């Protein structure tokens, strides 16, 4: 199983390269990797297991974070109670259309690869449409808004060597743009 020992931290060259597209079908090893990436998110949300391995709770992980420059990502957002849940393993994910309006988390953004916390708000698109392939090569299309949209753009940014703190305005970090929504 993947543990914090497999997560490379900020400064490692792989987090800044541009992940390679995957050729379908995936090799046996690539499926195992993607499946283990998701299993990591599950483990990190399980209080028991998470505490044993010291895993930080998280809802998204990109392949580049475990030193695999490939365009695969796993996202696991639990049911916040409103029934809406998100459990996806995506291959060659691609944002094909998005909103002009912006959105952002109040508390800023974090990253398992970044040990120390960062200040500013991260302004992303409030709505996006993603086209990607599932673990078996079939087509998946997602329309997302708000938080879920934020999570996916975060993970997708890794595939292009972009870190969340790259978006923060070196000016008023804590200052929201002229109206992008909150959350
Ligand atoms: Ni991150």
Swiss-Prot record:
Protein biosynthesis as UniProt keyword: yes
Record keywords, A-Z: Hydrolase, Iron, Metal-binding, Protein biosynthesis
Residue stretches spanning the membrane: none
Reactions mediated catalytically: N-terminal N-formyl-L-methionyl-[peptide] + H2O = N-terminal L-methionyl-[peptide] + formate
Example GO BP: translation
InterPro entries in UniProt: Peptide_deformylase (IPR023635), Peptide_deformylase_sf (IPR036821)
Cofactor mode of binding and number, as noted: Binds 1 Fe(2+) ion.
Pfam families named in the record: Pep_deformylase
EC number: 3.5.1.88
Active site: 155
Required cofactor names: Fe(2+)
Binding-site residues, Fe cation: 111, 154, 158
Record has Metal-binding as a keyword: yes
Principal EC category: hydrolase
Domain of life: Bacteria
One GO MF term attached to the UniProt entry: metal ion binding
Entry-linked PANTHER family: PEPTIDE DEFORMYLASE, PEPTIDE DEFORMYLASE 2
Family recorded in the similarity comment: Belongs to the polypeptide deformylase family.
Stated role: Removes the formyl group from the N-terminal Met of newly synthesized proteins. Requires at least a dipeptide for an efficient rate of reaction. N-terminal L-methionine is a prerequisite for activity but the enzyme has broad specificity at other positions.
Protein name (Swiss-Prot/TrEMBL): Peptide deformylase
Record gene name: def
């Amino acid at each position: 199983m993947l543990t914090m020992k497999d997560i490379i931290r900020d400064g490692h060259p792989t987090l800044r390269q541009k992940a390679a597209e995957l050729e379908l079908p995936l090799t046996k090893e690539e499926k195992e990797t993607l499946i283990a990436m998701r299993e990591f998110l599950v483990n990190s949300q399980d209080e028991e297991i998470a505490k044993r391995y010291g895993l930080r709770s998280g809802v998204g992980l990109a392949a580049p974070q475990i030193n695999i420059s490939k365009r695969m990502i796993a996202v696991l957002i639990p049911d916040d109670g409103s029934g809406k849940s998100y459990d996806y393993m995506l291959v060659n994910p691609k944002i094909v259309s998005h909103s002009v309006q912006e959105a952002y988390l109040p508390t800023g953004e974090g990253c398992l690869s970044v040990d120390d916390n960062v200040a500013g708000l991260v302004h992303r698109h409030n709505r996006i449409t993603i086209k990607a392939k599932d673990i078996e090569g079939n087509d998946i299309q997602l329309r997302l808004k708000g938080y879920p949209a934020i999570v996916f753009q975060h993970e997708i940014d890794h595939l292009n060597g972009v870190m969340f703190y790259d978006h923060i305005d070196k000016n008023h970090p804590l200052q929201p743009h002229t109206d992008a929504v909150e959350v």
